[PDB]
Amino acid sequence: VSQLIDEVDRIASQAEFNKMNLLQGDFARGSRATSMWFHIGPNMHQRERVFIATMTARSLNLKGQSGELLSLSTADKSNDAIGTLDAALTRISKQRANLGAYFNRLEHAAKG
Amino acid sequence: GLRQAERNTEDGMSLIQTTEGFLQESNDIIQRIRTLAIQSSNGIYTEEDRQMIQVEVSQLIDEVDRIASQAEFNKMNLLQGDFARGSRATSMWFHIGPNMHQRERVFIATMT
């Protein structure tokens, strides 16, 4: 589990498109870091925002803010751990649905 | 006057074609939303799945109003409603004759 969690952290920290990190949360809703803005349109103010939420291991609750990874060393704490990665899977699926909606909208915009 | 009127009616044909092409993608988006609604009425889905599909629905209406407020032929908006039947803003005519009053009017309703 520790190896897998480290892999998730590495994926979040290293994934990028054009030397811009995406899953770290720089383009998230409540972020002062930066804001994504496409320019689908031939005039001055035809821009649209794109929101990508932070996908690190703290966001998915796979590790505490103190750095303690989600532990399954005992049966009792392994049983209640299932809710944690259930919430993580819900977050991942919601973000994937958001990205798919953005994809569909952009495809329609390009076709038009 | 006859030559200029032929040029003007060709320009009007271009405008009509542009407007219809703009309406095509909005029609397709509405059909997509209808398919989503039909596939959403089944009771097997939970609240989270319906929220996820509502994300795509929200994106699709956002796209629809984007086309409505961004469609433009000659630096003039068409689908906003400036040429509707009860257009309080302006009216547009297609001078298709070589004489003083040989003209016609075309209506473009609101599509927001």
Side-chain angles (χ1 to χ4, degrees), chain A residues 63-85:
Chain A
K63 54 171 308 280
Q65 200 50 75
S66 59
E68 213 281 315
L69 307 192
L70 174 55
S71 181
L72 322 178
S73 65
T74 64
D76 314 71
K77 81 167 71 157
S78 71
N79 198 330
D80 48 41
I82 306 166
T84 310
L85 44 282

PDB file of all heavy atoms in Angstrom, chain A residues 63-85:
ATOM      1  N   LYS A  63      -3.302  10.000   2.718  1.00  0.00           N
ATOM      2  CA  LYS A  63      -2.289  10.244   3.732  1.00  0.00           C
ATOM      3  C   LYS A  63      -2.649  11.518   4.480  1.00  0.00           C
ATOM      4  O   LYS A  63      -3.140  12.478   3.882  1.00  0.00           O
ATOM      5  CB  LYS A  63      -0.889  10.360   3.119  1.00  0.00           C
ATOM      6  CG  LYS A  63      -0.776  11.395   2.017  1.00  0.00           C
ATOM      7  CD  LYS A  63       0.672  11.619   1.614  1.00  0.00           C
ATOM      8  CE  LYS A  63       1.542  11.926   2.819  1.00  0.00           C
ATOM      9  NZ  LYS A  63       1.409  13.347   3.246  1.00  0.00           N
ATOM     10  N   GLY A  64      -2.407  11.516   5.784  1.00  0.00           N
ATOM     11  CA  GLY A  64      -2.702  12.677   6.594  1.00  0.00           C
ATOM     12  C   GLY A  64      -1.774  13.836   6.291  1.00  0.00           C
ATOM     13  O   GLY A  64      -0.737  13.701   5.639  1.00  0.00           O
ATOM     14  N   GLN A  65      -2.172  15.014   6.777  1.00  0.00           N
ATOM     15  CA  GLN A  65      -1.355  16.206   6.573  1.00  0.00           C
ATOM     16  C   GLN A  65       0.004  16.074   7.247  1.00  0.00           C
ATOM     17  O   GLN A  65       0.977  16.701   6.812  1.00  0.00           O
ATOM     18  CB  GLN A  65      -2.090  17.443   7.091  1.00  0.00           C
ATOM     19  CG  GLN A  65      -1.583  18.751   6.509  1.00  0.00           C
ATOM     20  CD  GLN A  65      -1.476  18.713   4.997  1.00  0.00           C
ATOM     21  OE1 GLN A  65      -2.482  18.770   4.290  1.00  0.00           O
ATOM     22  NE2 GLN A  65      -0.251  18.618   4.492  1.00  0.00           N
ATOM     23  N   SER A  66       0.091  15.266   8.305  1.00  0.00           N
ATOM     24  CA  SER A  66       1.364  15.010   8.966  1.00  0.00           C
ATOM     25  C   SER A  66       2.278  14.106   8.152  1.00  0.00           C
ATOM     26  O   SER A  66       3.458  13.976   8.499  1.00  0.00           O
ATOM     27  CB  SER A  66       1.121  14.389  10.342  1.00  0.00           C
ATOM     28  OG  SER A  66       0.398  13.175  10.231  1.00  0.00           O
ATOM     29  N   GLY A  67       1.775  13.487   7.089  1.00  0.00           N
ATOM     30  CA  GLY A  67       2.565  12.590   6.276  1.00  0.00           C
ATOM     31  C   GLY A  67       2.376  11.116   6.555  1.00  0.00           C
ATOM     32  O   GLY A  67       3.140  10.303   6.022  1.00  0.00           O
ATOM     33  N   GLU A  68       1.390  10.744   7.366  1.00  0.00           N
ATOM     34  CA  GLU A  68       1.155   9.348   7.713  1.00  0.00           C
ATOM     35  C   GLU A  68       0.256   8.710   6.660  1.00  0.00           C
ATOM     36  O   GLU A  68      -0.907   9.102   6.510  1.00  0.00           O
ATOM     37  CB  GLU A  68       0.528   9.238   9.102  1.00  0.00           C
ATOM     38  CG  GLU A  68       0.942   7.994   9.870  1.00  0.00           C
ATOM     39  CD  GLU A  68       0.191   6.758   9.423  1.00  0.00           C
ATOM     40  OE1 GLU A  68      -1.045   6.840   9.259  1.00  0.00           O
ATOM     41  OE2 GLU A  68       0.834   5.704   9.235  1.00  0.00           O
ATOM     42  N   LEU A  69       0.794   7.732   5.938  1.00  0.00           N
ATOM     43  CA  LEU A  69       0.044   7.068   4.882  1.00  0.00           C
ATOM     44  C   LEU A  69      -1.104   6.252   5.463  1.00  0.00           C
ATOM     45  O   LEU A  69      -1.075   5.835   6.623  1.00  0.00           O
ATOM     46  CB  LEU A  69       0.962   6.158   4.065  1.00  0.00           C
ATOM     47  CG  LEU A  69       2.234   6.769   3.472  1.00  0.00           C
ATOM     48  CD1 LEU A  69       2.855   5.819   2.463  1.00  0.00           C
ATOM     49  CD2 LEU A  69       1.946   8.113   2.829  1.00  0.00           C
ATOM     50  N   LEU A  70      -2.126   6.030   4.638  1.00  0.00           N
ATOM     51  CA  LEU A  70      -3.254   5.201   5.038  1.00  0.00           C
ATOM     52  C   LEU A  70      -2.773   3.801   5.388  1.00  0.00           C
ATOM     53  O   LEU A  70      -2.238   3.086   4.536  1.00  0.00           O
ATOM     54  CB  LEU A  70      -4.288   5.151   3.915  1.00  0.00           C
ATOM     55  CG  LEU A  70      -5.479   4.214   4.108  1.00  0.00           C
ATOM     56  CD1 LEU A  70      -6.192   4.517   5.415  1.00  0.00           C
ATOM     57  CD2 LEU A  70      -6.435   4.329   2.935  1.00  0.00           C
ATOM     58  N   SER A  71      -2.964   3.409   6.643  1.00  0.00           N
ATOM     59  CA  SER A  71      -2.390   2.182   7.173  1.00  0.00           C
ATOM     60  C   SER A  71      -3.438   1.081   7.256  1.00  0.00           C
ATOM     61  O   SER A  71      -4.596   1.334   7.597  1.00  0.00           O
ATOM     62  CB  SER A  71      -1.782   2.421   8.556  1.00  0.00           C
ATOM     63  OG  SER A  71      -1.197   1.236   9.064  1.00  0.00           O
ATOM     64  N   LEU A  72      -3.019  -0.144   6.933  1.00  0.00           N
ATOM     65  CA  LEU A  72      -3.852  -1.333   7.080  1.00  0.00           C
ATOM     66  C   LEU A  72      -3.186  -2.383   7.959  1.00  0.00           C
ATOM     67  O   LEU A  72      -3.489  -3.573   7.833  1.00  0.00           O
ATOM     68  CB  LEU A  72      -4.188  -1.934   5.713  1.00  0.00           C
ATOM     69  CG  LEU A  72      -4.462  -0.992   4.540  1.00  0.00           C
ATOM     70  CD1 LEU A  72      -4.733  -1.798   3.286  1.00  0.00           C
ATOM     71  CD2 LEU A  72      -5.632  -0.079   4.842  1.00  0.00           C
ATOM     72  N   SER A  73      -2.280  -1.967   8.848  1.00  0.00           N
ATOM     73  CA  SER A  73      -1.516  -2.918   9.645  1.00  0.00           C
ATOM     74  C   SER A  73      -2.384  -3.703  10.621  1.00  0.00           C
ATOM     75  O   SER A  73      -1.951  -4.754  11.102  1.00  0.00           O
ATOM     76  CB  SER A  73      -0.403  -2.192  10.403  1.00  0.00           C
ATOM     77  OG  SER A  73      -0.937  -1.290  11.355  1.00  0.00           O
ATOM     78  N   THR A  74      -3.586  -3.223  10.926  1.00  0.00           N
ATOM     79  CA  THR A  74      -4.510  -3.926  11.801  1.00  0.00           C
ATOM     80  C   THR A  74      -5.856  -4.084  11.107  1.00  0.00           C
ATOM     81  O   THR A  74      -6.216  -3.310  10.216  1.00  0.00           O
ATOM     82  CB  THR A  74      -4.698  -3.192  13.137  1.00  0.00           C
ATOM     83  OG1 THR A  74      -5.295  -1.912  12.902  1.00  0.00           O
ATOM     84  CG2 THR A  74      -3.364  -3.004  13.837  1.00  0.00           C
ATOM     85  N   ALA A  75      -6.597  -5.111  11.527  1.00  0.00           N
ATOM     86  CA  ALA A  75      -7.884  -5.399  10.903  1.00  0.00           C
ATOM     87  C   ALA A  75      -8.881  -4.271  11.136  1.00  0.00           C
ATOM     88  O   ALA A  75      -9.647  -3.914  10.234  1.00  0.00           O
ATOM     89  CB  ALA A  75      -8.439  -6.720  11.432  1.00  0.00           C
ATOM     90  N   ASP A  76      -8.889  -3.702  12.343  1.00  0.00           N
ATOM     91  CA  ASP A  76      -9.873  -2.677  12.678  1.00  0.00           C
ATOM     92  C   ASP A  76      -9.705  -1.440  11.804  1.00  0.00           C
ATOM     93  O   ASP A  76     -10.687  -0.892  11.289  1.00  0.00           O
ATOM     94  CB  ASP A  76      -9.760  -2.312  14.158  1.00  0.00           C
ATOM     95  CG  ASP A  76      -9.661  -3.534  15.050  1.00  0.00           C
ATOM     96  OD1 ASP A  76      -8.606  -4.200  15.032  1.00  0.00           O
ATOM     97  OD2 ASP A  76     -10.638  -3.827  15.770  1.00  0.00           O
ATOM     98  N   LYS A  77      -8.467  -0.983  11.621  1.00  0.00           N
ATOM     99  CA  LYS A  77      -8.228   0.194  10.797  1.00  0.00           C
ATOM    100  C   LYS A  77      -8.221  -0.120   9.309  1.00  0.00           C
ATOM    101  O   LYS A  77      -8.280   0.806   8.495  1.00  0.00           O
ATOM    102  CB  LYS A  77      -6.909   0.863  11.193  1.00  0.00           C
ATOM    103  CG  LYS A  77      -5.671   0.224  10.597  1.00  0.00           C
ATOM    104  CD  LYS A  77      -4.462   1.125  10.781  1.00  0.00           C
ATOM    105  CE  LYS A  77      -4.032   1.182  12.238  1.00  0.00           C
ATOM    106  NZ  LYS A  77      -2.602   1.572  12.377  1.00  0.00           N
ATOM    107  N   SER A  78      -8.136  -1.397   8.934  1.00  0.00           N
ATOM    108  CA  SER A  78      -8.309  -1.773   7.537  1.00  0.00           C
ATOM    109  C   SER A  78      -9.776  -1.782   7.134  1.00  0.00           C
ATOM    110  O   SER A  78     -10.099  -1.475   5.980  1.00  0.00           O
ATOM    111  CB  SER A  78      -7.685  -3.144   7.282  1.00  0.00           C
ATOM    112  OG  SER A  78      -8.444  -4.167   7.900  1.00  0.00           O
ATOM    113  N   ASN A  79     -10.670  -2.132   8.061  1.00  0.00           N
ATOM    114  CA  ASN A  79     -12.094  -2.188   7.747  1.00  0.00           C
ATOM    115  C   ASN A  79     -12.639  -0.806   7.413  1.00  0.00           C
ATOM    116  O   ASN A  79     -13.303  -0.619   6.387  1.00  0.00           O
ATOM    117  CB  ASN A  79     -12.859  -2.801   8.921  1.00  0.00           C
ATOM    118  CG  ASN A  79     -14.242  -3.287   8.532  1.00  0.00           C
ATOM    119  OD1 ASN A  79     -14.876  -2.745   7.627  1.00  0.00           O
ATOM    120  ND2 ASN A  79     -14.718  -4.320   9.218  1.00  0.00           N
ATOM    121  N   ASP A  80     -12.363   0.180   8.266  1.00  0.00           N
ATOM    122  CA  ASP A  80     -12.864   1.528   8.037  1.00  0.00           C
ATOM    123  C   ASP A  80     -12.086   2.275   6.966  1.00  0.00           C
ATOM    124  O   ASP A  80     -12.526   3.347   6.538  1.00  0.00           O
ATOM    125  CB  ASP A  80     -12.846   2.328   9.343  1.00  0.00           C
ATOM    126  CG  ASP A  80     -11.528   2.216  10.082  1.00  0.00           C
ATOM    127  OD1 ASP A  80     -10.467   2.251   9.426  1.00  0.00           O
ATOM    128  OD2 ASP A  80     -11.553   2.094  11.325  1.00  0.00           O
ATOM    129  N   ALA A  81     -10.944   1.742   6.526  1.00  0.00           N
ATOM    130  CA  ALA A  81     -10.193   2.377   5.452  1.00  0.00           C
ATOM    131  C   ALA A  81     -10.949   2.364   4.133  1.00  0.00           C
ATOM    132  O   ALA A  81     -10.708   3.234   3.291  1.00  0.00           O
ATOM    133  CB  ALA A  81      -8.838   1.691   5.280  1.00  0.00           C
ATOM    134  N   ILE A  82     -11.869   1.414   3.945  1.00  0.00           N
ATOM    135  CA  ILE A  82     -12.573   1.278   2.673  1.00  0.00           C
ATOM    136  C   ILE A  82     -13.363   2.538   2.344  1.00  0.00           C
ATOM    137  O   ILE A  82     -13.497   2.909   1.172  1.00  0.00           O
ATOM    138  CB  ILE A  82     -13.476   0.030   2.702  1.00  0.00           C
ATOM    139  CG1 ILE A  82     -12.656  -1.204   3.079  1.00  0.00           C
ATOM    140  CG2 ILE A  82     -14.149  -0.179   1.360  1.00  0.00           C
ATOM    141  CD1 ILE A  82     -13.494  -2.397   3.469  1.00  0.00           C
ATOM    142  N   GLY A  83     -13.895   3.220   3.358  1.00  0.00           N
ATOM    143  CA  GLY A  83     -14.571   4.479   3.103  1.00  0.00           C
ATOM    144  C   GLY A  83     -13.645   5.529   2.519  1.00  0.00           C
ATOM    145  O   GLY A  83     -14.048   6.325   1.667  1.00  0.00           O
ATOM    146  N   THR A  84     -12.385   5.535   2.958  1.00  0.00           N
ATOM    147  CA  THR A  84     -11.436   6.539   2.488  1.00  0.00           C
ATOM    148  C   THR A  84     -11.188   6.411   0.990  1.00  0.00           C
ATOM    149  O   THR A  84     -11.331   7.384   0.237  1.00  0.00           O
ATOM    150  CB  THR A  84     -10.124   6.421   3.262  1.00  0.00           C
ATOM    151  OG1 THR A  84     -10.398   6.392   4.668  1.00  0.00           O
ATOM    152  CG2 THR A  84      -9.224   7.600   2.953  1.00  0.00           C
ATOM    153  N   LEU A  85     -10.829   5.213   0.525  1.00  0.00           N
ATOM    154  CA  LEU A  85     -10.608   5.072  -0.907  1.00  0.00           C
ATOM    155  C   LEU A  85     -11.911   5.026  -1.692  1.00  0.00           C
ATOM    156  O   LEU A  85     -11.891   5.286  -2.896  1.00  0.00           O
ATOM    157  CB  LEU A  85      -9.739   3.848  -1.233  1.00  0.00           C
ATOM    158  CG  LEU A  85      -9.841   2.436  -0.644  1.00  0.00           C
ATOM    159  CD1 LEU A  85      -9.229   2.363   0.743  1.00  0.00           C
ATOM    160  CD2 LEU A  85     -11.262   1.913  -0.647  1.00  0.00           C
TER     161      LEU A  85
END
